[PDB]
Design a protein around this ligand. Structure first.
Ligand SMILES: Nc1ncnc2c1ncn2[C@@H]1O[C@H](COP(=O)(O)OP(=O)(O)OP(O)(O)=S)[C@@H](O)[C@H]1O
Ligand SMILES: Nc1ncnc2c1ncn2[C@@H]1O[C@H](COP(=O)(O)OP(=O)(O)OP(O)(O)=S)[C@@H](O)[C@H]1O
Ligand SMILES: Nc1ncnc2c1ncn2[C@@H]1O[C@H](COP(=O)(O)OP(=O)(O)OP(O)(O)=S)[C@@H](O)[C@H]1O
Ligand SMILES: Nc1ncnc2c1ncn2[C@@H]1O[C@H](COP(=O)(O)OP(=O)(O)OP(O)(O)=S)[C@@H](O)[C@H]1O
Ligand SMILES: Nc1ncnc2c1ncn2[C@@H]1O[C@H](COP(=O)(O)OP(=O)(O)OP(O)(O)=S)[C@@H](O)[C@H]1O
Lengths: 579, 564, 182
């Protein structure tokens, strides 16, 4: 009775009502059955990603058996899901595994009606060229009943075929696609009463919907039927636990809180409508960055067109970050990544100074099958492949060899980008920011904080002259970045100093600073320039403040409630008297 | 009732007050409960690293069961731990624990309230495998029975799911955090009277505090619930032992001395001079490696910021050193280990220049960090390292989180990481005077960025560029090498003096020190004109001991009266 | 037994571990040829010299053979009859008896099974304190083969002595060589 130890009797579970209802797989079920109905090599295989409901297909078939919706020869069939891990774990000895596996094969061959197996990843039986995978579902499989329903990740299917041949002759492919968000919801709806019964809760129909939507957007590593169900089952658990600790599985709140825990994203104010309207990109970016904030509005306009659904779905929003050096080029770009995609980590930096004709494109997209390195994607596709909500920020684009720019422009128009290995990535949901300081030299004329037309058309003039015009025509907008007012520097300094307080995670220590005018002016004066940005402010704080503090901490000259010493250079004051 | 011998009613033990309160750990416990409440992937597993506090979590769970702070679906459930030891210890012959084990599960499955089992050693599924790889969990779970709370460390968990994907459908990966030292102290305070009773030694509250501080400082790869408690139990044993030999209290410094003697490293002997030398690290180092004032400054600042707790907390002192050969790139790395941990050996070599992921994964991810947790890691030619190496380095740079073994994290933010590259040599070799000059240094960063993404450059505490090792430095270096040569003489008879030491120095700097090889030529010239000639005079029995060296032009060894 | 030289702390710590409650059961772990047996020999001498804490003052230390099991399996289960005999006797009444196991990896048996009750119920209760020792590499083998031993035994890494310390050792043993060799 080896099947009683190594396999799950799916048929009896079906009979007992222990299997989930199956939604959206009728044809996969029919196909699985169709193959099983065959006389010879009746061995279908469910090929596709883990988490897409492949078990559901099997469970579906098991139910068909129970309800007698099965072809004659299969009506009396019993299904067993064979656990290959259980069979091999702890095997050690020469023929330990071999005996167990043969054991279940014999039980199948030995009279007890038709038994069909479900294999927990058929590719695991590749072996070291068979040999070690012996007779494990080999030739008997082709004729002597022993019908097997296999399953595998498609990539591994390919490997078992290429490294075996006979396997291909023995199995029939059935490909299984991942459900769409809507279909996912249909699945969730079919299963809704099972969750309500198990948890003892009420599930809003809309909860099922928002779970599926969040599943796609924030937990992409999982398949939709996997993720959405986890969101539902977890929220329901959440409600049951919290409720009972001292039933409304709310579509907004319980789904969001669960997602927050699973995604590492606070349950923010960022409802889709706020994001679509970008109300807060203006408000938050206005707070996060300084200078002429109307540049934000220009960006927001492009974004809203894509958010409205009116934009061509294949044309990612993009703009040219054209302007003054020192203006927080990457600060803004990171902050818009921050707000727009709800994470600064979405930013990808691409260095376009490193782009000679001979290799430029391959450096960004990766070299091809054969040449030095297969680290496909270099800078672009190897990040885009994981972060579809990323931002591509390109430094010094004006120096890029034109072929790169051509690839980039194609990446914007019907914006599917393919790596050097032929891996299509697709940039449709990405925001692209090309950047250039080409015109910074005109802005540097210092004609007030706001760029006047008298320089604006020199800044953009140079760009229009420099790039062949389609460069600009294929970009949603060109946004011009203005000069900081002295007050802008003061705000940056205040922000940075606050960052230092946070730097001190060990918040037993912090600054009071004092000299909030004199030290602030020392610092701000040293950083108030178009060719500086905060680079010197950062350096002064790292050195004149923190390295000097380290000396004072080490000498017990400073303990906490820390203050600054300015002679105008800068160091910190002694608080405890050399203790 | 096999369970009367093999199932421990953790719930009842909590009811009777047999289990300890646990530091606010409840937040994680609530996630355990939520998982048990689930329909799908209903078996949580407590996953972490030694000192995880796994049992403590379970004890907390048991207390919640007593409070019945659970969902209706889990309500009234009892938590029973399995006596895996007795079940298998009594396995006189094949089939004995197998039937007892299954017996217990079958009894657990019926009548005696809903039961969730706690299964420590969950990796046993891959050990007591074969039939048991299923019997232990699967058939029961296939009936909706036997919900369990499993537990193990990251190494095991990963191997379980890698070997058996069933666990990704049957279990939830409940990661467990290291507690705050404040929580650790709370643990220690709760245990304080137990320790007093155990040893007859009172523990000073500030001793409980320092144990947490010390443990985190010297054992980055062990969690506080293990290591801080060891410091207290060791120190208490220490005091008891001292008293057994000849108030009976553990002081903070008792524990400090324990840590020092326990590890051989004076973890808390932060004498004023420990901090003052840091103030003077740039000064002291300039006599250990010569000059290179800008490089030793970069190091000193990073170390001073790390030691003082000012460096971004997620940034171990860490450097990428650029320079020409003979610059002292290696020597500084060693002198930093010398200076900071009182031993130049407090470093770990990694052959980055020879890495490829297929093997780098085992060649790098090893146990050296378990023996020298404060070391200066020496990664040679990281520039040509496989991206896998570099990727793990990003994990390392982010608070020392080096992945090791089967998934064990080091967290050595108290270690120093030194990486080397010659990438910047492209412009360092401009040799524009002495100190790296304007333009050259910018070009160097341009060179650095050829292989070092912002991913590294904005995590490393400093990219450090060595200067042309100048003639001024050479005069001081010569003094060091001449000293070294005497030190080198393991055979005591080879004792010498340098006549005209200054002229020897002149020759070493003048006909030795190539501008392009740093101090290399000093080592070579001494050998070329001094040691070579000595070897002959030694073999010719001209020189025995207290020999001296002269200078002509051509170094001139003296000749002693015939060898004695 | 040669008069252990220089291992002052190692002995103190070995004993302190016996004095500890948590993982109160030390093993000397390290490179082969550094004196780990010498340290335990040192413990025996220190007990004899009455330079030890009262908890092991007058204690008796024994080195247990393979023969505890390898006396002969003739009679399946005799391995346990003998090992249990010994474990009981060691715990049995006669002041503190301390067990020395040289190359503790032998206790692993052929992958558990044969290991039977070797120190299983003993370690489980903090009884029969054992001072063990093994090659660092074997230590790692034990951690994988048994696991429980790592959770019960205290790991004490023992370092190689310096050249100067080595000279002190040689000096201390010098008369044994001079006498033996003439
Ligand atoms: N279409 C569906 N009908 C019924 N149940 C579903 C459906 N999709 C998902 N589920 C449930 O959600 C899970 C999806 O799991 P699957 O993708 O079948 O797991 P799997 O097929 O074993 O892949 P792995 O390798 O075990 S993740 C199942 O365990 C079902 O409980
Ligand atoms: N307009 C701004 N808003 C917010 N922060 C700014 C702004 N301008 C400069 N900064 C600061 O300057 C730093 C960001 O500089 P980056 O954008 O990387 O460099 P840059 O300012 O674009 O020009 P370069 O080429 O580095 S001089 C951050 O530390 C910001 O705090
Ligand atoms: N946070 C805590 N609060 C109260 N008691 C604790 C706490 N942490 C640990 N303890 C006590 O110390 C022990 C916890 O040890 P375990 O969790 O079994 O060891 P561990 O943390 O699992 O290390 P591993 O992984 O088994 S080597 C228990 O005996 C608890 O009573
Ligand atoms: N600043 C210095 N002070 C004293 N000795 C030095 C100094 N710089 C170099 N040396 C000598 O240079 C020798 C070896 O130099 P290293 O620093 O190893 O060469 P390097 O610069 O590290 O090049 P790599 O990449 O490590 S071969 C040492 O053994 C010292 O004798
Ligand atoms: N510190 C010491 N004092 C006295 N004798 C020592 C010392 N260190 C080593 N020895 C002698 O040198 C040998 C080292 O023996 P051991 O301690 O067994 O070696 P080990 O470290 O046990 O490696 P194994 O496992 O026994 S091969 C012994 O024969 C000791 O007599």
């Amino acid at each position: 009775e080896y099947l009683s130890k190594y396999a799950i009797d799916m048929t009896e579970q079906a009979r007992q009502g222990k299997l989930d209802p199956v939604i959206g797989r009728e044809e996969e079920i029919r196909s699985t059955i169709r193959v099983l109905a065959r006389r010879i090599k009746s061995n279908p295989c469910l090929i596709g990603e883990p988490g897409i409901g492949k078990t559901a297909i099997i469970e579906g078939v098991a139910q068909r058996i129970i309800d007698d919706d099965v072809p004659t020869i299969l009506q009396g069939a019993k299904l067993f899901s064979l656990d290959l891990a259980a069979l091999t774990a702890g095997a050690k000895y020469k023929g330990d595994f071999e005996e167990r596996f043969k054991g279940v094969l014999k039980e199948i061959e030995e009279s007890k009606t038709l038994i069909v197996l479900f294999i927990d990843e058929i590719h695991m039986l590749m072996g070291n060229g068979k040999d070690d995978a012996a007779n494990i579902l080999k030739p008997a499989l082709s004729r002597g009943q022993l019908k097997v329903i296999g399953a595998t990740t498609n990539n591994e299917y390919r490997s078992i075929v290429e490294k075996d041949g006979a396997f291909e002759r023995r199995f029939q492919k059935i490909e299984v696609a991942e459900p769409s968000v809507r279909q996912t919801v249909a699945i969730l709806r079919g299963l809704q009463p099972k969750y309500e019964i198990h948890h003892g809760v009420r599930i809003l129909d809309s909860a099922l919907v928002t779970a599926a939507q969040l599943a796609k957007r924030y937990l992409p590593y999982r398949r939709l039927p996997d993720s959405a169900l986890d969101l539902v089952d977890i929220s329901c658990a959440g409600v049951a636990v919290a409720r009972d600790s001292k039933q409304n599985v709310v579509d907004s709140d319980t789904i969001s809180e669960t997602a927050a825990r699973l995604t590492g994203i606070p349950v923010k104010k960022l409802s889709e409508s706020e994001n679509e309207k970008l109300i807060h990109m203006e408000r938050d970016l206005s707070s996060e960055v300084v200078g002429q904030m109307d540049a934000i509005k220009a960006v927001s306009n492009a974004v809203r067109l894509s958010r409205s659904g009116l934009a061509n779905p294949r044309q990612p929003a993009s703009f040219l970050f054209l302007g003054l050096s020192g203006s927080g080029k990457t600060e803004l770009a990171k902050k818009v990544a921050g707000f727009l995609f709800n994470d600064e980590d979405m930013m990808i930096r691409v260095d376009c100074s490193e782009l000679s004709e001979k290799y430029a494109v391959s450096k960004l997209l990766g070299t091809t099958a054969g040449y030095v390195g297969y680290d496909e994607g270099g800078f672009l596709t190897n990040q885009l492949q994981y972060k579809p909500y990323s931002v591509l920020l390109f430094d010094e684009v004006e120096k890029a060899h034109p072929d790169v720019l051509t690839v980039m422009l194609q990446m914007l128009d019907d914006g599917r980008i393919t790596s050097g290995q032929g891996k299509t990535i697709d940039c449709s949901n990405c925001i692209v920011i090309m950047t250039s300081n080409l015109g910074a030299e005109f802005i540097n004329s210092q004609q007030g904080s706001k760029i006047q037309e008298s320089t604006k058309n020199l800044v953009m003039g140079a760009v229009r002259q420099h790039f062949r015009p389609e460069f600009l025509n294929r970009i949603s907008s060109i946004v011009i970045f203005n000069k900081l007012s002295r007050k802008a520097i003061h705000k940056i300094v205040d922000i940075r100093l606050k960052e230092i307080e946070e730097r001190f995670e060990q918040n037993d220590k912090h600054y009071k600073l004092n000299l909030t005018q004199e030290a602030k002016d020392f610092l701000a004066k040293y950083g108030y320039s178009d060719d500086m940005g905060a680079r010197p402010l950062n350096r002064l704080i790292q050195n004149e403040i923190l390295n000097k503090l380290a000396l004072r901490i080490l000498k017990n000259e400073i303990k906490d409630k820390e203050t600054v010493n300015v002679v105008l250079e800068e160091c910190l004051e002694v608080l405890p008297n050399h203790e």
